Amino acid sequence: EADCGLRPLFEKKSLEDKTERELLESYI
Amino acid sequence: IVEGSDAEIGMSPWQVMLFRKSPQELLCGASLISDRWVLTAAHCLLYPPWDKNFTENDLLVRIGKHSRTRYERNIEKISMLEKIYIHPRYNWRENLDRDIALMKLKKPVAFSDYIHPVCLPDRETAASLLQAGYKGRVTGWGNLKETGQPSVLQVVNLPIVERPVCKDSTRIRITDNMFCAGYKPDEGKRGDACEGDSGGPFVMKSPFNNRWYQMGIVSWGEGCDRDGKYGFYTHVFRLKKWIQKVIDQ
């Protein structure tokens, strides 16, 4: 809960899953 | 999940598998929100119209999984249930209003690279991201089309849809505790969730702080990936106070 939403294999190691930018881009 | 694709390992570590004990059978998706709590769709447990009225010892929960079927040893963790908690205003007679449920685990789970909890949104966070056209992400082991089931976990990304458009896309008495999402026929993209995906999470990444928050629970639809139909997800935030109350207990 203190460390929620940060995935060990992505946020924590500073990697993008291969469709997350799909999502971010959608914010226009 | 229709018009999705294989999920990358550890890409959804809050994904939980809801699992019937006899016949051993995957039932539904679910989501890890702490070490000792899991969130799923009420109808995964209680649906009189199909005679479903499962209880605690009827089920188990499987966390950290990827393969739909095999026992992923020293990866997945399995938990039994202490308590099931259904929303008291949960409506199975008409429309699945407040299709939401909590399961407390007999023993809290250890987080790992494949097992981690999701955030729940604020007023602030829900206010800004739960807006039409903005995209989220549905994951589940559910069916791949309406008329077969996938070997590994599926992911798809879907745009939220304008409240009016959801209302005009169906007959079911829609409420404020539901939102719809999916593409339109103009847009020439596809995607939807399906039978078996219930309980799993519609999540969104915050561009402010980089975390994943669970905005929806997979609740219902009309067929799967149908033209001019939209998936329906329980509105999580709207029911956050119930959640919060049950956990503090």
Place this chain on the structure above:
DNA sequence: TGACGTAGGTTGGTGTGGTTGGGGCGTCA
């Protein structure tokens, strides 16, 4: 042809099923 014997993976091992698939490959009967 086929089965022994043998080797990681998102993970062990007097392991090759197990509450779970099927590895890749050369020998050999």
